[PDB]
Amino acid sequence: SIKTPEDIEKMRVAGRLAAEVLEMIEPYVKPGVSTGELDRICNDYIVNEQHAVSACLGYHGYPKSVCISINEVVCHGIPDDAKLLKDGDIVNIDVTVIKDGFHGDTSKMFIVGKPTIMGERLCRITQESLYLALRMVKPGINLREIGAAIQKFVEAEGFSVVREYCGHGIGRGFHEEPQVLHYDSRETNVVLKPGMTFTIEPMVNAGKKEIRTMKDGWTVKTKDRSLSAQYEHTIVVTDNGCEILTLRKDDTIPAIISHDE
Ligand SMILES: [Mn+2]
Ligand SMILES: [Mn+2]
Ligand code: NA
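Structure tokens for the assembled complex are given below, as produced in the milestone run.
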């Protein structure tokens, strides 16, 4: 799927909105706030201000507008009014918006209250793994290299990479081809071409890689109950690199990454 100059522009709009939801919610992510209220804030904003729609809601029956995962929760945490954030917590807020027919998908970690050493480190190393992978993207390279480089980096830090979930192609469809694994796999055989749009979203655990799913059909936790973090960005392969469509002001990497010169 090679997006056209116009479709790419739409992806920029959808990606920007997704990223802006994360920038907007930051001030609300504090101790004592419930994940349920954070969700309502994000939804009212997406609908009433961005004039877009959450792609998560209803997707395979997902009940909320955004996914919020805390500490040992790996992904797909469901916003709840009874779940309050507290100091030391590391929280992922996963956002997916649909606008003008195109999707914008992204997520980041938030450290609540006073940070713990492992909390700050895990999140930091996880973002560094995403950035390292991003700096690699450019026409010609094979997706298998990006996944191999992520796993290599993360494991040398003494952490592990989650296997059950992966990045994905994205466009008029929420999840399109190809699959973007965050570890080395002999199945990956894709040569990036300019115009391609997909996501990179590594999930990293402080302990072992195994993840156990809960009895609600969604919530995934680490088997050993160790902390797990994830960061996600949607990108578009440019002629000499890539462009991050969901870049935020707090990101410390440039929107456009060039390689030719
Ligand atoms: Mn995604
Ligand atoms: Mn996502
Ligand atoms: Na987590």
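The longest strand covers residues 90-99. The CA atoms of residues 159 and 206 lie 5 Å apart. Further analysis is deferred to the final report.
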